[PDB]
């Protein structure tokens, strides 16, 4: 997360972590961020699992403010399985979304609290006006150049780049598709707000009908935090029939 400030997990109780075990050492390493959509299902980005980790290698952490430091009302889970989108482009990052499932005894994993609750899914008819300010969260690196990652959740706000400014031409010729979504800080005074290395699978939440609804999943961007070079996200509204049709 470039820009913004540290967060309390109560401000974004839908934000989660993902830890893949050291293939060689013992113990967990930080992999990607996550968004709790169901009580036992979370959304993330597909390319976080290009190296095919087995599900018992992934551990999702909900209701935690700091990266490694656990929380009081925190809830820790072990992934039973995860669903990467079938036609995911490991080269242009199109269809960047993956469906993670939590393992539990009796078909219930998370329970609502002040630090843990699900986030609302967007309607398939949702087209917000251009330059709408939305907040994003993660534990990722601060600048594109910061050596280590963040030891605490950071929140930042960005505006929605229109479809005209969100073309392949405007992002160093790189492929940009209608399953993607552009967002960046449009200020004129530096340190613009943008996601960064370590927030993939994180949320991009906007206010719709007075309801903070999940809009985009942090995908990529020629970051971190550049002027007039927006960040690219996964257009969640297109995969509702992928969320719904799965997880049964």
């Amino acid at each position: 997360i470039k820009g913004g400030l540290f967060a309390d997990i109560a401000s974004h109780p839908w934000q989660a972590a993902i830890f893949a075990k050291h293939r060689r050492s013992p113990g967990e390493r930080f992999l990607c961020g996550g968004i709790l959509i169901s009580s036992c299902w979370i959304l993330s980005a597909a390319h976080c699992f290009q190296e095919r980790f087995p599900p018992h290698h992934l551990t999702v952490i909900l209701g935690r403010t700091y990266r490694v430091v656990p929380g009081e009302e925190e809830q820790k889970f072990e992934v039973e399985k995860y669903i990467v989108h079938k036609e995911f482009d490991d080269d242009t990052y199109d269809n960047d979304i993956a469906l993670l499932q939590l393992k539990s005894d009796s078909s219930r994993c998370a329970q609502e609290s002040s630090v843990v609750r699900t986030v609302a899914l967007p309607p398939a008819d949702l087209q917000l006006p251009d330059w709408t300010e939305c907040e994003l969260s993660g534990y990722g690196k601060h600048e594109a150049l910061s050596p280590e990652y963040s030891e605490r959740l950071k929140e930042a706000h960005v505006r929605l780049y229109p479809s005209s400014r969100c073309t392949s031409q405007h992002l160093l010729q790189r492929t940009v598709t209608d399953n993607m979504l552009c967002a960046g800080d449009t200020r004129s005074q530096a340190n613009l707000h943008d996601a960064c290395q370590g927030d993939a699978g994180g949320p991009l939440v906007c206010l719709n009908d007075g309801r903070m609804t999940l809009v985009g999943i942090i995908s990529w961007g020629l970051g971190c935090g550049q002027k007039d070079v927006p960040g690219v996200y996964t257009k969640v509204t297109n995969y509702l029939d992928w969320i719904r049709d799965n997880m049964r």
């Binding site: 990607c32 980005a45 990722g140 790189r174 990529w220 961007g221 970051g223």
Partner: peptide, 13 residues
């Protein structure tokens, strides 16, 4: 600018 630093917001090993 043919090789930018990140271009993919995941946390690699």
């Amino acid at each position: 600018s043919t090789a930018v630093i990140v271009s993919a917001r995941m946390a690699p090993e």
